[PDB]
């Protein structure tokens, strides 16, 4: 599924990401844009055995278990397969375990390189939420 930015912003807000750990809502919508282009089925394999899954590209070596990645830690304690639905719940649940403090969004390379330092609020203005 491909979310429109406003529809995604509303869902992320309902699931508690607005100002979660001090990060305003636009940061999360911006992260999804640059990580998965708002596609809940996005996938990306990296040089390392790792593969990122879902709207927020959750990593298979540290956060979710896909059972094909060497050194799997599964800190969110959940199958990656379970992170590719149209319902963003599981992905948000894991994202909240990943971000434990105010440096936490650095967990997403794209957020760090393409959202941080930009007007992330621009991804949500005019959205009804």
């Amino acid at each position: 599924k491909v979310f429109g930015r406003c529809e995604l912003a509303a869902a992320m807000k309902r699931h508690g990401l607005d100002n979660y750990r001090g990060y305003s809502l636009g940061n999360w919508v911006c992260a999804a844009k640059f990580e998965s282009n708002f596609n809940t089925q996005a996938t990306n394999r990296n040089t390392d055995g790792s593969t990122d899954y879902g709207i927020l590209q959750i990593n298979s070596r540290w956060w979710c278990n896909d059972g094909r990645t060497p050194g799997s830690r599964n800190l969110c304690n959940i199958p990656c397969s379970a992170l590719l639905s149209s319902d963003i719940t599981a992905s948000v649940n894991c994202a909240k375990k990943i971000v434990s403090d105010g440096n936490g969004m650095n967990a997403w390379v794209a957020w760090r390189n393409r959202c941080k330092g930009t007007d992330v609020q621009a991804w949500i203005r005019g959205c009804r939420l």
Partner: antibody
Amino acid sequence: QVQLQESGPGLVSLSITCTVSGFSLTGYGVNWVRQPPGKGLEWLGMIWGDGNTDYNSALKSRLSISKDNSKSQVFLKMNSLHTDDTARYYCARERDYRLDYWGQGTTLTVSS
Amino acid sequence: DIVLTQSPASLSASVGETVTITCRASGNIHNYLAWYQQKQGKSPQLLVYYTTTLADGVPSRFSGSGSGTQYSLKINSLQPEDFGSYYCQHFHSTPRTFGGGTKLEIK
């Protein structure tokens, strides 16, 4: 160790410098705010981590903000100076829509 | 531009009293409102951001609230270090503006 310090002309085109440390200008905005003696705060403008700039609408034609990421410096340039411009000028770091660290400010008096 | 109207301009209070400051925006600012405290001869310091979140180190006796176009800052049983000026500022798009300020003085 986030720090910001303003440097300026004192009495006076004008340019004020904001020298920062403890963070990268590429990841944070820097806003310029002023306060005339005994008065309130007035927003002047800002430069985002990505270089985009936005300004006070009434003052937009006389203000220019720019920066040098490698030297950790931000600059406020004002033209057509007026006595109404006499005030303490502050630069302040913006972290995700709040100004979390501010300089001590620099006083400016328009040769009047 | 969105303008902020802050009231009252001054408040005379004694340690232990509770006071409230208001800030209403001419247009919806969607929770993007922060509060600053400024002591005589010092720079403003962040107190509250995104309407209700206390900045690090700020005592819990401070509380912020509001939504849409109307916001408030409340100080419960104020202390000596609380006297000074307070300003609200919005961050909904640009340009940003500040309220006119409020001076909290000893009664």
